[PDB]
Structure 1
Amino acid sequence: TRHSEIIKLENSIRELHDMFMDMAMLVESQGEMIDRIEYNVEHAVDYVERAVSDTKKAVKYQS
Structure 2
Amino acid sequence: TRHSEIIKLENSIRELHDMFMDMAMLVESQGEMIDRIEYNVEHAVDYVERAVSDTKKAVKYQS
TM-score (norm 1): 0.95
| Corresponding residue for residue 44 of structure 2 | 44
Residue 6 of structure 1, CA deviation: 0.8
Aligned partner of residue 42 in structure 2, secondary structure? helix
Instruction: Map 1:19-38; keep pairs closer than 5 Å.
Output: 19-38=19-38
Deviations 1:17-46 (A, max 9, x none): 111011000000001101100110001001
Q: What stretches of structure 1 of length at least 5 have no aligned partner?
A: none
- Matched residue, 2:3: 3
Give the length in aligned residue pairs.
Answer: 63
State the percentage of identical aligned residues: 100
Q: Structure 2 length normalisation: TM-score? A: 0.95
